């Protein structure tokens, strides 16, 4: 059912505000949103192009892509996921960088790395192992499925830690400012690697990444005061989703709360900030949310707020804002500091024009999950013409091609 | 100016809670309030007889008293204040918790290490050092008046360390049960010894006890396990004041964050409660205030809320809960989940019937800061006497004497 919604031009939403070095003029964001309609050597594609040309036509919207991968050993997915490790990469995702900002928009890229929820039949193509902080499973059936192919979990060493600082997500951030990105986010959430690294139920490491709070935010740290010096800290983001359970992080049930794993790091990134190397924005995941589903009003079991007593600078939220719709209370509780952006997701997915949607208080259609992670323009890029011009097979057919 | 207020007989605030093995009767506290009229050699006396005795009518009442020494080495204070380390203390400290429990009501005792801010003066004519975490001064004055005398203030060593866990607080503990205290209460809170430990500014030991949030932590737990397994848990009960700036503690300005060095703290008690060893109160001090003094509304820069995020037990809340008074809007909802209890030090000063007053809306008579500190009854006692037959001079004449 569609969802029927007030004005927000008159709100702090449509006041511009200043993230990095780029102000934005609308406090609306789409935040990274997997779609697999990559191609299948992980290069951009014409369907990426038209779906983020689609979303960036109110004049300073900041766009958020999806998950990208920093290195082959940094991909294990089934579908076709974008990669920024090679030229090729970069030069396509650069046709639609240029198409974003000829529309006066911005775009920050998320990076990637899976670990231990690789699948490991993927892995085993390319010559490589799952890996980790320390060598543990989601599930006991993703632990039985990987040995079933002969390759298990391993636990990087010392060595392909400092790797990750200085050649993995180095070249990456590199690939990714010869591609036109205006920022390029470390995905530190949803149980996938850095979040691995940073909490006790996933990383039981003997080394300095590990047997602390200290050591095991130690390499979360090392990628942002490396890269603010090859990027500078200004096109630096981060994403947390410190109450998720998604891919089993045990969240508040560890032996470690989140409240206090998720102070220390943003307090750390606070300390930084304080001496001029302040990254551009912190990215968060309201409990409301938990990965790329929503979670019930009794599960919800502690806020973010803490984040916004620790740091000073840009805070970007997301996770289902139109539950308390029509009116958005809480929403526009959450912009009044006038430094906090939020995140549309799925709704982003089915309205291509959103952040127009939203000003005028135009009901929101409705998205269709089902196709949220197919291969074709089904569901993908469909939202953005006549509904009565879309001919279904036609476009299932229509799968991603390259671009020019 | 004296302060109207509604009547809370039909709040929460006098629904029974079971706290350890003992039911109160109200949720409202007497907070720890040091007071200096306890004898010249720190043993109780016929005043603070009366002074406790007095505030324990409403049956079911839960009293904390004013800090205690537990040992020479933890006093360092000019006033007269009590301790809980030898046997003649304890049998006068009997005689105040028989008054409280013939009368249906608790009494916890706060155990208290002055630490880094000992008055140098004192301990010399103990011959003893200024101790601590590590070897640092309030202030700057604090540093030379300590030089001054020649006595400045040392670093327990790592075996001085074991001694306040297995000497020091035991024989305490041990005191205290033998004194008749149905809790004992570590006050890990106001930059005293515990809270010296706790927090970066005043910890930078090389040792176990310091270097980690752990480590600092380390010595903390060690005393609550320890005791547990001497009092048993539902004896014990802590306080902190994760915000205040109280003799020089950094707060949200050290180089951990308190809700870094806290929810890590509270989640660990957290973890024992779950074994079946849960301590019976975590006692918080709101950011309104800092130790005895408030703090303005655009110095709180943070919120308990965390505590009841991680502790799904009892909580103390106290600081300026009038502020919203005649309604106490914000003390209705901090008592909202029926595990929290509110405490009222100053007013209770002058309200010997405090209990009573709030339960039926009595105007609550102002507190006389002057007379906080001193020496004689004049301002400590008077208040349950009709005001008209106060004699200011026969009762600033007396002075603590001895009981019976
Ligand atoms: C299909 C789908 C794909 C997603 N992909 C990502 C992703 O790659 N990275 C990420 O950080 N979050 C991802 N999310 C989570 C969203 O960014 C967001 O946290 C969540 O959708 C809450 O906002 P919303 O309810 O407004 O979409 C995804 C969500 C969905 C539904
Ligand atoms: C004179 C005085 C003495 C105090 N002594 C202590 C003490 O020994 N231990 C302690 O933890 N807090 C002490 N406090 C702080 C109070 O327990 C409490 O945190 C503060 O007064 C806020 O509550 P109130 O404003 O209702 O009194 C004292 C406060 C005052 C005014």
């Known amino acids: 059912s569609s969802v029927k919604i007030s004005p927000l031009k008159d709100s702090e939403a449509f006041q511009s505000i200043k993230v990095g070095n780029n102000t934005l003029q609308t406090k609306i964001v789409y935040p990274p949103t997997t779609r697999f309609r990559a ?48 030229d090729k990469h970069a030069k ?43 060598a543990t499973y989601e599930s006991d059936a993703a632990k039985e499925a990987a040995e079933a192919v002969g390759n298990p979990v391993r636990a990087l060493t010392t060595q392909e830690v400092k790797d ?18 205006d920022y390029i986010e470390l995905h530190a959430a949803h149980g996938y690697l850095l979040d691995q690294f940073l909490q006790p139920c ?41 109450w998720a359970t998604f891919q089993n992080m045990k969240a508040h049930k560890d032996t470690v709360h989140p409240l206090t794993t998720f102070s220390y790091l943003v307090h750390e990134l606070q300390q930084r900030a304080d001496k001029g190397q302040g990254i551009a924005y912190i990215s968060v995941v309201e409990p409301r949310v938990s990965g790329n589903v929503d979670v019930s009003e009794e599960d919800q079991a502690g806020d973010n707020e803490f984040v916004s007593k620790i740091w000073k600078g840009v805070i970007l939220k997301a996770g289902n804002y139109s539950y308390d719709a029509p009116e958005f209370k809480t929403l526009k509780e959450d912009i ?16 291509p024009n959103l952040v127009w949607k939203l000003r005028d208080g135009i009901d929101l259609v409705p998205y269709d999950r089902n196709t949220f992670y197919s291969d074709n323009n089904y569901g993908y890029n469909t939202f953005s013409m006549d509904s009565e011009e879309v001919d279904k097979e036609l476009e299932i057919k229509r799968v991603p091609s390259a671009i020019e």
């Open 336 to 351: 009044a500091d006038k430094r906090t952006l939020v995140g549309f997701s799925r709704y982003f997915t089915s309205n």
């Open 39 to 86: 191609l299948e050597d992980h290069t951009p594609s014409d369907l990426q192009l038209q779906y983020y040309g689609d979303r960036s036509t109110f004049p300073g919207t900041l766009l958020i892509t999806e998950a990208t991968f920093v290195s082959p050993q940094a991909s294990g997915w089934e579908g076709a996921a974008p990669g920024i490790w090679t």
């Open 92 to 134: 396509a995702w650069k046709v639609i960088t240029d198409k974003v900002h000829a529309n006066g928009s911005f775009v920050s890229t998320q990076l990637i790395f899976l670990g231990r929820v690789a699948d490991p039949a993927v892995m085993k193509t390319r010559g490589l192992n799952p890996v980790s902080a320390s």
């Open 164 to 181: 990750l600082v200085y050649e993995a997500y180095t070249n990456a951030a590199q690939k990714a400012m010869d591609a036109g990105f």
């Open 202 to 242: 996933t990383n039981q490491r003997t080394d300095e990444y590990g047997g602390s709070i200290e050591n095991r935010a130690r390499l979360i740290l090392e990628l942002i005061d490396h890269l603010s010096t090859i990027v500078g800290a200004d096109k630096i983001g981060i994403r947390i989703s410190p």
